[PDB]
């Protein structure tokens, strides 16, 4: 078959609450312990099964529907974690992918605070994951939103570090708290006379005062060893677990 | 807008010859003259319009249908250029994206030769664009195909340079003739204290093989200037032209 995703299809799916948060664990690189997670959206379409984000997020962004989607994902994430919030490790980080439209929408900050207040400000840390692809623009208006969120104890990550066109300029405007190295670099062989120099360079550029580095996309122990050896702070990847449904995240990570 | 497609849908589209070669011009960095092109597939679906490769190539590759697709694209490319082959610049390069399945299929080399023989061996140069993503495996069998194609005056490019896990190893197994710097790096701002150091590093690593370098994805004169100044040999990008249909490529680039 040939299914076509249009704004009308996404909008109906939102009405039916078919966009679910799946969750991928994040770990301390030095101790191996659970420190957090990233929420990754999945469209659980009753007739066709699970549709991944690459087959709808870009249209959700250009149509504006992402705003409603992310609002639902944040409510649902809170609903999943509320019953086990007392079992989470202290300072448990929750990563939410935030596109430019979401960030700039009126009431965004109130939705962030609502998630934090449900789970416990003393307990979790909300991490808003931003990207240089189709980015938040550098305006005083955008920086004011960013600063207000920071003042309310919300933090930020930069996704896909090493792939952006003007990353220093971006970080100047949006001084985030975490740098997530793009998976492409995380998976490069240290011994390779080309690729080992690339990942070396990217990781060195990522070392900035106060910024914690997350190596995302770790698939093998040898990738993990390279990142650990470079003093990266957090690890995320298929080696540990792909993203899983809420209940499975609770059963396999919060409880283990 | 997002098309969720099955092997059965691709196969029917191949039966209907709906996969068309679009063509993007490539230029000499020093003189600005037309030197070649890259063929980029477009699914011209009669009911829904033009579907880009990101919404079907990966399934074409995993299903095996890419083999038939590329065979069609090569025949069609020859059919487009045959009527104007005498008007092409001498040594006109034709870049064809070749996935692992295509490369390894019996009769691949004969399909390459058929294209070359139609357009003229002393006239064009067929360039097979390979990628480290889902790559040809490093086996004696694979290297024998690669060598035989080289002995028949066919050449190779490495796509997406700067993104592969073990690029030196890859080039040692598959000693290509051109390096294409990935667009992500070509578009980095030289003045950026992060991104300028990344593109600097990637371009210096791209010299290491001592091959011709193509900068793809050039969108601004400043990107072009950075690449020209670094001694890159060829330029390709929206600054000059996006990929266009065959007739338009002939009318706008081949002809004057
Ligand atoms: N091969 C491999 N892949 C790994 C590994 N570890 C993690 N990943 C995948 O890498 C992606 C990480 O998220 P991302 O870079 O922000 O990249 C994300 C993000 O840009 C976007 N996205 C996902 N969820 C959301 C969302 O709720 N909102 C928005 N605006 N974008 C989202 O979709 C992209 C793709 O998401 P997913 O398909 O869920 O793909 C996810 C994740 O499952 C690994 O070890 N190996
Ligand atoms: N933003 C921007 N983009 C530019 C610019 N100049 C060129 N591009 C785009 O960058 C891509 C370059 O091809 P690629 O990296 O091999 O990346 C290709 C290639 O991996 C694959 N693909 C395309 N045609 C074929 C094919 O016939 N066979 C196979 N196996 N893969 C193909 O799909 C990918 C995407 O192709 P396209 O969507 O046609 O996208 C093309 C091209 O239109 C620029 O200045 N700005
Ligand atoms: O657990 C550490 C956290 C690092 C920031 C990332 O964005 C989410 C997880
Ligand atoms: O025109 C020069 C050619 C360089 C190799 C590329 O793969 C296509 C164009
Ligand atoms: Ca992310
Ligand atoms: Ca990533
Ligand atoms: Ca290519
Ligand atoms: Ca590329």
From Swiss-Prot, chains A, B:
State what induces this protein: Autoregulated. Directly regulates its own expression in a c-di-GMP-dependent manner.
Q: Which residues are recorded as binding Mg(2+)?
A: 38, 97, 129, 159
Q: Name one GO biological process term.
A: positive regulation of DNA-templated transcription
List the catalysed reactions: 3',3'-c-di-GMP + H2O = 5'-phosphoguanylyl(3'->5')guanosine + H(+)
Q: How is the protein's activity regulated, according to its record? A: Strongly inhibited by Ca(2+).
Binding of substrate: at which residues?
24, 41-42, 97, 159, 183, 216-219, 238
Task: Give additional notes from the record.
Answer: An overexpressed EAL domain (residues 77-362) has similar KM, Vmax, pH and metal dependence and subunit composition as the full-length protein.
Q: What is this protein called?
A: Cyclic di-GMP phosphodiesterase PdeL
Point out the gene that encodes the protein: pdeL
């Amino acid at each position: 078959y040939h299914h076509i995703v249009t704004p009308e299809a996404i909008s109906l799916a939102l009405e039916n609450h078919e966009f679910k948060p799946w969750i991928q664990p994040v770990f301390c690189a030095q101790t191996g312990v659970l420190t957090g997670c990233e929420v990754l959206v999945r469209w659980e379409h009753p007739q066709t099964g699970i549709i991944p984000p690459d087959q709808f997020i870009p249209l959700a962004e250009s149509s504006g529907l992402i705003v409603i989607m992310t609002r639902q994902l944040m409510k649902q994430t809170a609903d999943i974690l509320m019953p086990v919030k007392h079992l989470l490790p202290d300072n448990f980080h929750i990563g939410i992918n935030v596109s430019a439209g979401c960030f700039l929408a009126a009431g965004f900050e109130k939705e962030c605070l609502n998630l934090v207040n449900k789970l416990g400000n003393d307990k979790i840390k909300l991490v808003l994951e931003l990207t240089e692809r189709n980015p938040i623009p550098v305006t005083p208006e955008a920086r004011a939103i960013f600063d207000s969120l920071h003042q309310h104890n919300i933090t930020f990550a930069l996704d896909d570090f090493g792939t952006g066109y003007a990353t220093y300029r971006y970080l100047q405007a949006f001084p985030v708290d975490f740098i997530k190295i793009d998976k492409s670099f995380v998976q490069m062989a240290s011994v390779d006379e080309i690729s080992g120099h690339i990942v070396d360079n990217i990781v060195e550029l990522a070392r900035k005062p106060g910024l914690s580095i997350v190596a995302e996309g770790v698939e093998t122990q040898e990738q993990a060893d390279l990142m650990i050896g470079k003093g990266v702070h957090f690890l995320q990847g298929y080696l540990y677990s792909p993203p899983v449904p809420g209940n499975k995240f609770i059963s396999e990570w919060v409880m283990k």
